[PDB]
Design a protein around this ligand. Structure first.
Ligand SMILES: O=C(Nc1cncc2ccccc12)[C@@H]1CCNc2ccc(Cl)cc21
Ligand SMILES: O=C(Nc1cncc2ccccc12)[C@@H]1CCNc2ccc(Cl)cc21
Lengths: 304, 304
């Protein structure tokens, strides 16, 4: 028992981190097979970021201007291309530590682990979620660009995020490994404000199920509700609307605890309306929404 | 910016995890050089746990009764010894992935990363702290025994914890890598209740400094206090007494923000007395105490 914000073991991804320098900009790259992936803004100076024309800027760059260093050995760059907001640097050597991998574009509400890196070296690993407003609440400093987000299924690493920027609000924006930003963000030093950060209802319910499994049962009440009644309350509290798809996905947690999904919705509805009254759930004084139903089942069953 | 409960990259420790089976009990072991470390309760059946005499039980075990499997290849056991509550299994092969390492015994209030494992395979990584009552609030299921806690300083892994048991309250107890339990716990299936879980004051102040650095400044007030006045309030709220050593350790955070330590104590004192009033600090509705001053400086500077 016990419930923690757990990240995937990062070893498979640490073996892929390299440093990419172009001129005076140094950031991280991801080395898979003979290709190094990195944010295209590695070719920019801070002055270029105001209004960069990446195609024009890239014309003044050759293979030898991209310095790729893995550990402490230099990789030879034999090709470069821009795909959306990422640069793919073809190196002459395949990464011998390349794990089995996929590039996936995740949906908001989905969680992933981030291995924060600086100068191609890992500093830490943490778990976060793609927010409904397509930002992530990460922990990134200058130089962290190119750090990646991923999930692991047994031996396959599904890369889903590459870090590109921090918005003035301290939230983070980035792309999938094809270079497409999550949300409406653009890799430019301009006024970009995040939209409403709504709460991921299905995740909060999964975490309520995790609390029941781990012994925290005080919030269970004698009520039930309907999807429509629950959603009237959820909209008022800037919670995402709950769908039958979400109820279906919560099925295994409902089966394990014997608490019907709509009964858990009524419990959540009362927690929204009455607050916690100074109490905690799984050591938290707020409703946690960065654990998916899959994460709860995984953590409570011990998938390796 | 952004502040997350960050764990160390786990790769160096993943390369050390093996599976140890003795009879019908399977748990995890740590393979460093030619020695595999594991909880001595691997030699027990659940019936033995009621009142085990480990010396007597170990007499009926030979080298060939300890099955050590690294990945999917069997290691040959050429010696075994009991040191306190751990077994050291001498294997004929040194772990080729052994990182630079130390065995350290940590003090309460110190934080570390745990790589939770099942059948010698990593499932996840999370950060936690040695509580003042010598328990840890982990996330461990049956089979997780032998999972380790560690810190990394550049390339050196300081192993500090080996997981042994879960108390009836859902908190966890374990040993340092010399087999000595943290706290008064014994590896026996008996009535062991944890003591008062006090809050690590120095860590809460470090996290208040992290919040100021990351923009959350609403809790800063116009007051100051003294160590004695602050400690009168801290005792009332089951917070550890703050010492001049703690003030000294908070010095770099005080310098970075320009907020004197005793002024931050007055802010904390008001937060204890008045509560949060429905507000949050670094996305939390409670005062977080599992970040040391070293962790705050590390995360805010990007040590790799
Ligand atoms: O955001 C960026 N980098 C960072 C990323 N994460 C956390 C940071 C913390 C502190 C300083 C920088 C950080 C970069 C540089 C600033 N301007 C800018 C504009 C557009 C793009 Cl695509 C990238 C950037
Ligand atoms: O605590 C133990 N294991 C576990 C450890 N962590 C989380 C667990 C969750 C669920 C089931 C077991 C868990 C073991 C078995 C039970 N009794 C026992 C008594 C003494 C000692 Cl030293 C070990 C043990």
């Amino acid at each position: 028992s016990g419930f923690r914000k757990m990240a995937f073991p990062s070893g498979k991804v640490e073996g892929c981190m390299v440093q990419v320098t172009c001129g005076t900009t140094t950031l991280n790259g991801l080395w898979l097979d003979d290709v190094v992936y990195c944010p295209r803004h590695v070719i920019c100076t801070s002055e270029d970021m105001l209004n960069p024309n990446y195609e024009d800027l890239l014309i003044r760059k050759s293979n030898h201007n991209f310095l790729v260093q893995a550990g402490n050995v230099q990789l030879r760059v034999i090709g470069h291309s821009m795909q959306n907001c990422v640069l793919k640097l073809k190196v002459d050597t395949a990464n011998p530590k390349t794990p089995k991998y996929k590039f996936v574009r995740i949906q908001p509400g989905q969680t992933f682990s981030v291995l924060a890196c600086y100068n191609g070296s890992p500093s830490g690993v943490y778990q976060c979620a793609m927010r409904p407003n397509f930002t992530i609440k990460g922990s990134f400093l200058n130089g962290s660009c190119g750090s990646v987000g991923f999930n692991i299924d047994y031996d396959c690493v599904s890369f889903c995020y590459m870090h590109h920027m921090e918005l003035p609000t301290g939230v983070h924006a980035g792309t999938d490994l094809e270079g497409n930003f999550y949300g409406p963000f653009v890799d430019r030093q301009t006024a970009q404000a995040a939209g409403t950060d709504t709460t991921i209802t299905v995740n909060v319910l999964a975490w309520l199920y995790a609390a029941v499994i781990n012994g925290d049962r005080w919030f269970l009440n004698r009520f039930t509700t309907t999807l429509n009644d629950f959603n009237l309350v959820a909209m008022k509290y800037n919670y995402e609307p709950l769908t039958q798809d979400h109820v279906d996905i919560l099925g295994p947690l409902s089966a394990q605890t014997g608490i019907a999904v709509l009964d858990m919705c009524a419990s959540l509805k009362e927690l929204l309306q009455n607050g916690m009254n100074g109490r905690t759930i799984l050591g938290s004084a707020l409703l946690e929404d960065e654990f998916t139903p899959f994460d709860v089942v995984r953590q409570c069953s011990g998938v390796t």
